[PDB]
Amino acid sequence: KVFGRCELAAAMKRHGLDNYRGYSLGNWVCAAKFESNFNTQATNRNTDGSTDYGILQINSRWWCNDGRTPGSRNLCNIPCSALLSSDITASVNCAKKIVSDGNGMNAWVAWRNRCKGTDVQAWIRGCRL
Ligand code: NA
16 A cells, blocks of 8 residues: 555554654654655565565564575564555554664664654644644
């Protein structure tokens, strides 16, 4: 599913992401925009053989199992296919673990390169929240 911006904001808010680990909602919406364009089914292959899955592009080397990433971990206890669902629950639950891993939202490269230090409140302006 391809979310609209304020639709995703609302979904994220309901699943407890606003101000999780001190990151406001706009940070997550911004991260999702530039990681996936709000497209739950997004996948991307990396040079190391891993793949990123879903609306926040969560990586199979550490968080999910794709059966094709040697020697990898599955820190979130989920098939990487669970990350492509129109229901964002497994993505949001796994995201919460990742942001806790010590580097905060810097794990999402597009957050660091395109959202961090910007007025990310823009991303939820207009939204009935
Ligand atoms: Na894995």
